[PDB]
């Protein structure tokens, strides 16, 4: 997160860190057994880390649970990033509490102009790299479809939306991949892509979760 703020420990209790020896992506806990992340975060050997604030220190509220299965969306296209969503099943159910809590899926698609909360442990610099160890947060509005397509002509599908600031300076970034965009208390987006981070006229692009609720619900019901 570039240009954001330190959230405060466990104030984003649905935020997870995906660890394969190191933190490599975020995700969102949607019930005690399932995490939503980006398809571009797929790899083997995933451990889901819940209740995290500082990802380099065991502070006492964490739960570390190996993934038993990952399910990348059948239509994910890694060239265009269309359908950039994946489900991760936990080997055992998380113990839900005030610091580890699920986030609801949307029932409708959020509107342009809605202020959302984006969070993660990604790079905090728009040039160079610095990785924070505590969770960072960013308030960002959903941008109009017209502005999004003007920023990325020929690249925005109906399964994507832009959020952030066209003037730059505030954005998600590498390492935030797969983490939540929460609007009106529900999971509306997944950190997906963007040209650089926090660059002028290059806002963040996010998977449009409201288009995947049927697939999520049916997949969870059978796995
Ligand atoms: N929002 C962005 N600018 C962005 C986020 C994650 C990755 Br990976 C690349 C770009
Ligand atoms: Ca920790």
UniProtKB/Swiss-Prot annotation:
Annotated SMART domains: Tryp_SPc
Main localization, broad class: secreted
Protein residues bound to substrate: 171-172, 174-175, 177
GO biological process: digestion; proteolysis
Tissue specificity annotation: Synthesized in the acinar cells of the pancreas.
Keyword Protease: yes
Modifications made to the protein after synthesis: Subsequent cleavage after Lys-125 leads to alpha-trypsin. Further cleavage after Lys-170 yields pseudotrypsin. A cleavage may also occur after Arg-99.
Keyword Secreted recorded: yes
Cofactor: Ca(2+)
Binding site residues for Ca(2+): 52, 54, 57, 62
EC number(s) stated in the UniProt entry for this protein: 3.4.21.4
Disulfide feature: 7-137, 25-41, 109-210, 116-183, 148-162, 173-197
Keywords recorded for this protein, A-Z: Calcium, Digestion, Disulfide bond, Hydrolase, Metal-binding, Protease, Secreted, Serine protease, Signal, Zymogen
Family: Belongs to the peptidase S1 family.
Assembly behavior: Interacts with SERPINA1.
Name of the protein in question: Serine protease 1
Taxonomic placement: Eukaryota, Metazoa, Chordata, Craniata, Vertebrata
């Amino acid at each position: 997160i570039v240009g954001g703020y330190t959230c405060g420990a466990n104030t984003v209790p649905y935020q997870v860190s995906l660890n394969s020896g190191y933190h490599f992506c975020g995700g969102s806990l949607i019930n005690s057994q399932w995490v939503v992340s980006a398809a571009h975060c797929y790899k083997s050997g995933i451990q889901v880390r819940l209740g995290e604030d500082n990802i380099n220190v065991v502070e006492g509220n964490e739960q570390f649970i190996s993934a038993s299965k990952s399910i990348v969306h059948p239509s994910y296209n890694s060239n265009t990033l269309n359908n950039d969503i994946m489900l991760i099943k936990l080997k055992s159910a998380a113990s839900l509490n005030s610091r580890v809590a699920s986030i609801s899926l949307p029932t409708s698609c959020a509107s342009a102009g809605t202020q959302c909360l984006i969070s993660g442990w990604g790079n905090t610099k728009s040039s160079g790299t610095s990785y924070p160890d505590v969770l960072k947060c960013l308030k960002a509005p959903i941008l109009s479809d017209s502005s999004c397509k003007s920023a990325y002509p020929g690249q925005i599908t109906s399964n994507m939306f832009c959020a952030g600031y066209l003037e730059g300076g505030k954005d998600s970034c590498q390492g935030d991949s797969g983490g939540p965009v929460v609007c009106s208390g529900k999971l509306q987006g997944i950190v997906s892509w963007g040209s650089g981070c926090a660059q002028k006229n290059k806002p963040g692009v996010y998977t449009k979760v409201c288009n995947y609720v049927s697939w999520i619900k049916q997949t969870i019901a059978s796995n």
